[PDB]
Design a binder for this molecule. Sequence first.
Ligand code: CLA
Ligand code: CLA
Ligand code: CLA
Ligand code: CLA
Ligand code: CLA
Ligand code: HEC
Ligand SMILES: CC1=C(/C=C/C(C)=C/C=C/C(C)=C/C=C/C=C(C)/C=C/C=C(C)/C=C/C2=C(C)CCCC2(C)C)C(C)(C)CCC1
Ligand SMILES: CC1=C(/C=C/C(C)=C/C=C/C(C)=C/C=C/C=C(C)/C=C/C=C(C)/C=C/C2=C(C)CCCC2(C)C)C(C)(C)CCC1
Ligand SMILES: CC1=C(/C=C/C(C)=C/C=C/C(C)=C/C=C/C=C(C)/C=C/C=C(C)/C=C/C2=C(C)CCCC2(C)C)C(C)(C)CCC1
Ligand SMILES: CCCCCCCCCCCCO[C@@H]1O[C@H](CO)[C@@H](O[C@H]2O[C@H](CO)[C@@H](O)[C@H](O)[C@H]2O)[C@H](O)[C@H]1O
Ligand SMILES: CCCCCCCS[C@@H]1O[C@H](CO)[C@@H](O)[C@H](O)[C@H]1O
Ligand code: OEX
Ligand SMILES: [Ca+2]
Ligand SMILES: [Cl-]
Ligand SMILES: [Cl-]
Lengths: 342, 451, 81, 38, 334, 137
Amino acid sequence: ERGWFDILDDWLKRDRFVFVGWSGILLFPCAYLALGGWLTGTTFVTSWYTHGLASSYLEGCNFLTVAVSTPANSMGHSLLLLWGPEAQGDFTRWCQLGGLWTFIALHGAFGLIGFMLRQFEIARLVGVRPYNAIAFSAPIAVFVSVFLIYPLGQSSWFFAPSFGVAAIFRFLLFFQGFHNWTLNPFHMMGVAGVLGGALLCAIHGATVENTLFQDGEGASTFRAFNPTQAEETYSMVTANRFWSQIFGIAFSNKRWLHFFMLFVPVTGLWMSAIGVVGLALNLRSYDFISQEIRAAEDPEFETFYTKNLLLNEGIRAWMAPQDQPHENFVFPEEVLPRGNAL
Amino acid sequence: ATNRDQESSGFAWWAGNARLINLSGKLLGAHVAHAGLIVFWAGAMTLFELAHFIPEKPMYEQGLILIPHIATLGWGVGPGGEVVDTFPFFVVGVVHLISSAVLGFGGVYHAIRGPETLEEYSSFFGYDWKDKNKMTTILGFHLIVLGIGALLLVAKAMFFGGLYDTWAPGGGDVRVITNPTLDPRVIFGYLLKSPFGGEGWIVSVNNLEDVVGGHIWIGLICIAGGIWHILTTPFGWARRAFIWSGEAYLSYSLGALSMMGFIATCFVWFNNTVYPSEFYGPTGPEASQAQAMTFLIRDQKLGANVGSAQGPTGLGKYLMRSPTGEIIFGGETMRFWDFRGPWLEPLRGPNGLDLNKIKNDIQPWQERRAAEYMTHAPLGSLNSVGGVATEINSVNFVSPRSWLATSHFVLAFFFLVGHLWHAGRARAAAAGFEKGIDRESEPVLSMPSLD
Amino acid sequence: TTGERPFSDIITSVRYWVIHSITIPALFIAGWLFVSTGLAYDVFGTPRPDSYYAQEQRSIPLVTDRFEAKQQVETFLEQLK
Amino acid sequence: METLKITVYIVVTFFVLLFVFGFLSGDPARNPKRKDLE
Amino acid sequence: ANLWERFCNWVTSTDNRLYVGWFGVIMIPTLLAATICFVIAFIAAPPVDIDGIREPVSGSLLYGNNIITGAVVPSSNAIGLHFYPIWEAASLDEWLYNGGPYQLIIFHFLLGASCYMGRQWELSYRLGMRPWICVAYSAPLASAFAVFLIYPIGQGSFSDGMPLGISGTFNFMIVFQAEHNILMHPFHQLGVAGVFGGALFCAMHGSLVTSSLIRETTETESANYGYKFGQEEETYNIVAAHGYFGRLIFQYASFNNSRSLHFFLAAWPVVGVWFAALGISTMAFNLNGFNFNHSVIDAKGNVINTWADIINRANLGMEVMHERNAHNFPLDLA
Amino acid sequence: AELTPEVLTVPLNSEGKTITLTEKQYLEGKRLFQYACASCHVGGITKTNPSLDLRTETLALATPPRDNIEGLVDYMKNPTTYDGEQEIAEVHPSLRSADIFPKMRNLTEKDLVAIAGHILVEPKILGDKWGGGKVYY
Ligand code: CLA
Ligand code: CLA
Ligand code: CLA
Ligand code: CLA
Ligand code: CLA
Ligand code: HEC
Ligand SMILES: CC1=C(/C=C/C(C)=C/C=C/C(C)=C/C=C/C=C(C)/C=C/C=C(C)/C=C/C2=C(C)CCCC2(C)C)C(C)(C)CCC1
Ligand SMILES: CC1=C(/C=C/C(C)=C/C=C/C(C)=C/C=C/C=C(C)/C=C/C=C(C)/C=C/C2=C(C)CCCC2(C)C)C(C)(C)CCC1
Ligand SMILES: CC1=C(/C=C/C(C)=C/C=C/C(C)=C/C=C/C=C(C)/C=C/C=C(C)/C=C/C2=C(C)CCCC2(C)C)C(C)(C)CCC1
Ligand SMILES: CCCCCCCCCCCCO[C@@H]1O[C@H](CO)[C@@H](O[C@H]2O[C@H](CO)[C@@H](O)[C@H](O)[C@H]2O)[C@H](O)[C@H]1O
Ligand SMILES: CCCCCCCS[C@@H]1O[C@H](CO)[C@@H](O)[C@H](O)[C@H]1O
Ligand code: OEX
Ligand SMILES: [Ca+2]
Ligand SMILES: [Cl-]
Ligand SMILES: [Cl-]
């Protein structure tokens, strides 16, 4: 059958400069609106009525301090549709109420779905295995756990990350003070995957570039490679001997090496996502009970664990009134935890 | 287009200056043209500093790095470091600016008009990287030039006005150095000091008699060695230990420059003698000491006995002992008790800070200096907000010492990378595998297995 | 290659620049006037420098109700005199 | 402590000299290709 | 062949299971000293007066720590940057109280790891390789120098060096944020791009090469048996991978040259970590992150807060609480 | 909110006379205060002696009262301790000690008024932020 569906399928899969596909019907509008909404918001839209913050170029912020901030805590987990009961179809109120944040987060989520479908769709057309799409599950797990699940466990969208550079920095510091997130072994595994991934990236690329075969006469060795050549361009045998003698162990299987490079950062991001799902519920790894019992009774007992809780207590008391304005925290000077002199 | 494309020279455009390795005429021009740029910045930056300079603000409140160098040499300044005549500053900048036109003219001529190779032109100006004799001779000439340079500082210190002496009795002044230290026990004793706290290696030199005397030795050493290297050619033990190639010599210099950049970083950070605090602002140690001095003065005026005031930890609130017994300022500045400065030393006795001088001999000019230095601590943000990281906007200040130390640490670091890059490549190119492993001669395939 | 004219082809053609020496500055000026006329303020509800507070007030006009949030903001806006 | 100090001083001087005389002992020739680098 | 010549041929021998070499002659004893002292101190060392205020902090397992809270504690603030070898103490008991072990470990470690970089250069010369793997390792190596040596020098005390422990690392990072606002420093931001980017390109390169493996096995066997160690031919189709990735984005955003692809994989994380180490290294001299505290002001002069001001509130809480008994005067100047 | 003439009206002396500053004077006051005083008085505190701040309540209780233009102008010529008992020109920038505090050398009478006006107007704007220290940052 060559009906309208098949004809349309043909046009959608034309080999053009930007491939479209069926997946492109979802990807391009959602990715474009998520982007445009972030640019619109960081240029023109305030956070005065939701946070008490200026947050756009128009107010005088710079690239580091602009944001599309989350809605006010009184909005709860409202989808904040433009035509919803809060904005009631008013575009200006919608922006002042934080509507751009759900807009970006929701169109962003469906755009990422679209992008992963594009990896499946293009891989099926070209005839490769879909391991690139499988690897992209990790960014999606991070996005979904941090931007959707985390605030859904909390009181409202207000505590989701805001879309901005310094706003994200505040999120890092809030997670230290309130969640003791550095103590969390699921974050630790995430750190190991990201840093080990960076390591693998540098060490593989450095190793290839320094075990090249001399396949040309020029001092610039880039020219001596042909994409259709059948032979390996660097010496696995020499690479393997060098690292065996430098480090003790070495890769010998090139298929294993590259699978391992997929595996390490992907797994780490998945591990960090699980930790954040816990923090949605305040299910923290905040304390070691044995340390607290000893420290409560023995005022000479001190560890870096007890030192860091003092820091967290400072963060909470000093940032909370301005970071959570809907709470109306009034802390007199005399109650603020402070060391000597400072 | 001789060696001006990749096919002919073997080097891509992004390594295009490597095409100059064996083109001594064009390599000469590129070096002369670059020197013109160095001199250009010196003269132009100086004029810019002068134009923006207010004589009655401290130099270190004004973002100055070059005028402080000129002032340390004795020019423009009087007692206390007060600027008395900005015209020396103007002259230095103008003369560097004008000279850069002479260097740029020579650089652009040799680079694009003169002979591309000097060897067919002049056997004196031509050279072979592999000619060990010529290479040590060129090196010999430049060692003699460098030694003259070091003697010029001595000539200025001893015959042409002197140097600014932050330690001069009175509050600091220009002073003719009449008896520079010549005792090689002193001069080379600095070389053998530990670099750790309280010793400080050569960064610890704290008087112009030693500074001037050390440049007399360096001047003679360089001139001696330059004559030695013109008259000699490397010995066999030296011939076997080095690579003898243009890239190799470049890599040795890069290692030397990195080392000097790190030393310079520590010099401007700790030394307040050849970088006077009058001009560069207080060191980090200095401002921290100055805070303790300030509050000891405030509270003593209010009635506190500072010698016996027990602080919260049981250590003295104002005064305590160093690990070897010396009386030192308390609080976290305990780490800085190795600091020495002209405003603090009159309170110092044989056991360190002396309670009786503290009680009776603190002059108002010390209270002023300590408050000034405490409020110009070398702390500030990248957009030049002075103070701790939590300070609010108001004060437009980053210390010259921070600017100079950070800039030169970054430069020194990348010059060490450059050393490794070029020394590794030089080694590989001399041995013949810098382009890759020979497929039909792969070394590892002729070696027994490890297991 | 996928058929479209190469980009280096187009951006070194006289006709491209004939068209875009108008259209690029024209959009730029439209963006300028969007701010310079004050229109951006009113489209997005962003306060001007004299509109964050009332003259004596030091409280944030924070939205505290979900379904009357629109009236809360309109009320806050009236209270600017 | 004094014995410890001399012991370390001796051990360190020992290893540093190996390093220095090591790289002085014809090291550019210790490569698999061209073994004439003087 | 005299004895010195025999020894030199054994040191520089390419047949030793682990290559020794001349850097190895310094590396092996210094790394053993640092490792042995670290293991012993981590298990059994008594509490250390890190900040010089006679307030000892417990770091070892035997004194109440687990793997997460344990540390070798930095040497005392009373020592500053003074050299504190065992023989400068009146007793081992003094040395331990004042945190002697920290100095012994980091000084031996930094020498060993620097010779490790040298050894990477050295074996590559013996095997006829190109020499620049050691240059990639200079980025983690520079970073270790930053938190163990450079930052102490600029702040004047090894007591502000990074502790040798997991929770100790977090203490260092939090106090660093309060005193330098490192998050707002562009060199830490480039470092984050370096390691996020390196992790991205790591998964990418892995997924692309894995996606284009040439069928050489059946469904019941691991595909890794389709590559044989030392085979002459490539094991995946780089034309297929380019043809996929080029359509994912557009054709000219994809690499077709394996050599330049792998160079980019080297360069991106190495350059980024160099900047991160230069961040720590230049904040060591108190050139701190961007300060926009109270940068936005209204028509009357009211402060309009931004996210930078919220960050500052959190930085203040770290500032006022850290080292709670160690400051007597109102400004924390180092 | 904006910088109105009311905000800019401040006490000239102690007998109750006011004076109204222009926005130009106030911004000149801010710049000159940054130049000559903020290294110690940023935000209305006093880094070298935090017990004394520049809050108007504190200045009212100084001897003689410093909570007006004349009192502040006098202070920059001949500063005294809080009780008025001692003259502290030797340790505090002033016109009388312009030779040891050279940044005071190019301050005119009209500059002293503008610096004074800024000190009196700022607390009207910032409230507790002025003289409050880090707690109010
Ligand atoms: C300090 C910086 C510096 C200097 C001094 C040089 C110098 C040189 N380069 Mg290198 N290069 C540099 C940086 C520098 N380069 C950088 C950053 C790159 C990366 C892009 C390169 C990439 C590169 C490549 C790929 C090549 C060179 C080549 C050269 C040489 C010949 C240039 C030529 O013939 O062009 C002719 C250029 C012109 C005719 C145009 C005008 C050039 C003039 C000199 C500019 C002068 C302007 C100045 C204001 C005039 C003042 C005059 C006044 C004082 C009277 C020359 C010695 C070539 C070479 O090695 O040849 C063997 C070569 O192939 N360079
Ligand atoms: C005196 C110091 C010195 C000298 C004379 C040389 C000379 C050379 N280098 Mg070496 N190098 C050095 C230091 C030096 N290098 C340092 C300190 C490093 C560490 C980063 C290197 C790392 C290095 C590498 C990796 C390579 C070389 C190469 C070369 C050769 C070709 C260079 C070229 O044409 O670049 C052309 C110049 C450019 C393309 C310009 C680069 C632009 C820089 C990165 C911008 C820096 C930003 C700036 C400071 C601030 C921003 C300004 C902006 C706002 C306007 C040539 C022999 C090549 C080689 O091996 O040949 C044998 C090569 O591959 N160098
Ligand atoms: C020795 C180097 C050095 C140092 C320590 C200083 C220090 C200073 N300069 Mg000077 N200056 C320099 C060189 C230097 N400058 C050069 C080369 C120029 C020509 C552009 C100038 C022209 C200049 C002007 C016009 C002015 C200054 C000013 C100042 C002061 C404020 C600086 C500032 O706010 O920067 C802001 C911070 C930055 C710009 C950060 C830059 C980040 C760089 C681009 C990162 C690059 C890293 C590395 C080089 C690249 C490696 C790449 C890798 C791949 C290899 C400060 C004392 C100001 C002043 O107060 O004068 C009275 C001023 O107006 N300088
Ligand atoms: C140090 C860098 C340097 C070097 C090694 C050379 C070398 C050479 N030049 Mg070049 N040149 C240079 C810089 C340099 N020049 C500069 C700065 C200019 C612009 C003024 C020129 C302009 C120039 C021209 C127009 C010509 C040359 C020529 C030559 C060749 C013959 C020179 C000769 O025999 O004169 C004999 C020796 C002298 C006349 C002695 C000169 C003494 C000087 C002028 C007095 C001051 C010296 C003292 C060290 C000053 C220190 C200043 C410094 C600290 C800044 C020779 C290869 C010729 C050539 O290429 O032939 C084809 C040629 O025609 N040069
Ligand atoms: C730009 C400066 C410079 C350079 C690049 C050279 C370069 C050279 N010199 Mg010359 N030399 C110079 C200045 C210079 N010289 C001066 C000023 C003098 C007069 C003092 C001499 C007197 C001289 C003599 C007598 C000899 C040389 C020789 C040589 C050659 C061998 C170098 C070598 O193996 O050193 C390597 C250094 C060593 C082997 C000794 C150092 C021991 C170890 C490495 C410990 C030191 C490291 C430690 C961290 C340093 C810290 C400070 C220290 C003081 C504690 C080489 C071509 C040799 C030659 O072949 O002459 C024809 C030779 O016999 N030079
Ligand atoms: C640090 C070196 C300072 C500079 C620069 C300025 N001031 Fe100051 N000020 C300083 C101190 C230590 C004190 C307390 C003095 C004492 O012992 O009483 C002061 C006091 C004042 C006051 C009085 C505050 C009060 O509540 O009574 C005022 C009004 C004052 N200073 C003003 C002022 C001006 C206008 C300055 C710039 C020209 C200035 N100060 C600079 C420390 C320092
Ligand atoms: C939201 C919304 C929407 C949408 C809209 C849109 C879609 C928009 C778009 C927009 C856009 C689309 C925008 C854009 C912008 C851009 C910009 C603004 C840019 C800038 C840039 C720059 C600035 C650059 C920079 C740089 C870099 C980055 C690097 C290189 C260098 C340089 C520096 C150049 C709608 C209507 C649907 C509905 C409602 C809501
Ligand atoms: C080779 C080459 C190159 C380079 C070049 C160069 C590097 C050059 C330089 C050059 C130079 C280095 C030049 C200089 C010049 C200078 C001048 C031209 C000056 C003038 C001056 C004046 C005119 C002054 C004036 C005045 C006075 C006198 C007084 C005061 C005021 C005033 C300032 C006005 C390149 C890269 C491009 C590439 C190609 C090749
Ligand atoms: C001026 C002055 C002074 C003086 C100074 C002096 C006198 C100096 C000297 C200096 C010196 C006199 C230095 C030296 C140096 C040296 C070096 C730095 C060396 C190095 C070496 C090397 C690098 C080698 C290497 C090797 C080996 C080891 C093995 C074999 C191979 C080779 C060769 C590679 C004083 C301080 C008083 C004061 C201030 C001023
Ligand atoms: C504080 C550091 C002091 C360093 C002092 C340096 C002074 C330099 C004087 C020359 C010393 C070099 O002495 C060096 O020793 C050994 C013998 O032990 C020699 O013997 C060497 O010969 C060849 C050199 O290609 C090697 O293959 C061989 O393995 C080795 O035995 C070196 O050829 C000689 O150059
Ligand atoms: C290299 C350019 C030299 C230009 C001339 C510099 C003279 S320098 C001159 O020398 C005098 C002694 O006679 C000093 O009294 C005076 O302070 C000093 O500036
Ligand atoms: O020691 Mn560790 O931490 Ca660098 O600030 Mn100061 O000191 Mn202490 O206080 Mn904050
Ligand atoms: Ca010679
Ligand atoms: Cl702490
Ligand atoms: Cl303190």
